[PDB]
Amino acid sequence: TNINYYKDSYAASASRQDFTQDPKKFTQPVLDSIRELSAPL
């Protein structure tokens, strides 16, 4: 519904906000995806 009065792309304000969160990139950046409630070692 957001609208742009120019034929360029970079004159829009909030053209698509997005919910996308991936804690696995930083919080658990592990090879062996450990179990949620087990002993890691």
């Binding site: 360029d8 970079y10 004159a11 829009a12 304000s13 909030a14 053209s15 906000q17 997005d18 919910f19 996308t20 969160q21 991936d22 804690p23 696995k24 990139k25 930083f26 919080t27 658990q28 950046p29 592990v30 450990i34 949620e36 409630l37 087990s38 002993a39 890691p40 070692l41």
Partner: protein
């Protein structure tokens, strides 16, 4: 077929975290006591670098909460959506100063409050929305007209007030009055690189590099993106002390590789130099260890 060793890896040279869209806060389900061995979420191993996933349900007798707190305002898109000061120019057009123009190279590192925000992310990519507020040193507006030319790298810089560069047949310029609401302009991502870099662990050039004073260190040019000039539109000088702040917004932002927040105070613009004599400790000093205020 001629030799298996070359077709094996090439076939196995293919591409080697499907996170969901979280609209609200994370709710919780109930949980009862569980008295069993072998299964423990507390005793994790933070030494592996992982975050412990000791969820609230797995520690205490929790309840059922269907949360509703919105996470909309915490995303990076609306975190940098605020505009902020970037620079000031001092167009001291008077009798003594026989220049009539003032050139300022774009460096957002000059002011701390916007700087410390973008330091959290090492590589950024965005489009800008500049805003040139306009006023005199007294805060007074007057009936005058200004010119705001962007001078990219390599362009001829202006030389004076009557300079030919103000013909601006190619350079974008903003002609605006001083009795005007602030001029506002959108700016795209005009890097020669694919993404901005606030840091560069090296040098722009090859060759020798001295060890006594390294002024060329940590200066990548992919973010260094030319100058921006202003004059009053007049061939003879009008006596007024002008000072226009310049503000920018960041939109369509995409960050990468988060970086810690700088705690020490800033001392220079393009170099993150602190002082060994006054290390500003982040935490305030307490009385003793077991005396939480």
């Amino acid at each position: 077929d001629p030799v298996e060793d070359i077709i094996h890896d090439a076939l196995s040279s293919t591409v080697r975290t499907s996170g969901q869209d979280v609209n609200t806060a994370a709710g919780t389900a109930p949980s009862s006591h569980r008295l069993e061995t072998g299964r423990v979420p507390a005793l994790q191993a933070a030494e592996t670098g992982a975050t412990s996933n000791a969820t609230d349900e797995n520690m205490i007798e929790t309840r059922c909460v269907m949360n509703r707190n919105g996470v909309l305002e915490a995303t990076i898109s609306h975190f940098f959506s605020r505009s902020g000061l970037v620079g000031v120019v001092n167009l001291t057009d008077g009798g003594t100063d026989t220049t009539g123009y003032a050139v300022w190279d774009i460096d957002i590192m000059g002011f701390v409050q916007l700087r410390r925000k973008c330091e959290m992310f090492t590589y950024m990519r965005f489009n800008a929305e500049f805003t040139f507020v306009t006023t005199t040193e007294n805060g007074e507006a007057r009936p005058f007209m200004l010119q705001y030319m962007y001078v990219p790298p390599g362009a001829p810089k202006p030389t004076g007030r009557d300079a030919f560069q103000w013909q601006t047949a190619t350079n974008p310029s903003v002609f605006v009055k001083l009795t005007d609401p602030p001029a506002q302009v959108s700016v795209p991502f005009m890097s020669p690189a694919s993404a901005y870099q606030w840091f560069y662990d090296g040098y722009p050039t090859f060759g020798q590099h001295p060890e006594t004073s390294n002024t060329t260190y940590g200066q990548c040019p992919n973010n260094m993106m030319g100058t921006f000039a202003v004059r009053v539109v007049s061939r003879v000088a009008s006596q007024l002390k002008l000072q226009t702040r310049v503000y920018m917004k960041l939109k369509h932002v995409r960050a990468w590789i988060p970086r810690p927040i700088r705690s020490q105070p800033y001392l220079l613009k393009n170099f993150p130099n602190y002082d060994s004599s006054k290390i500003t400790y982040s935490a305030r000093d307490r009385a003793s260890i077991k005396q939480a205020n």
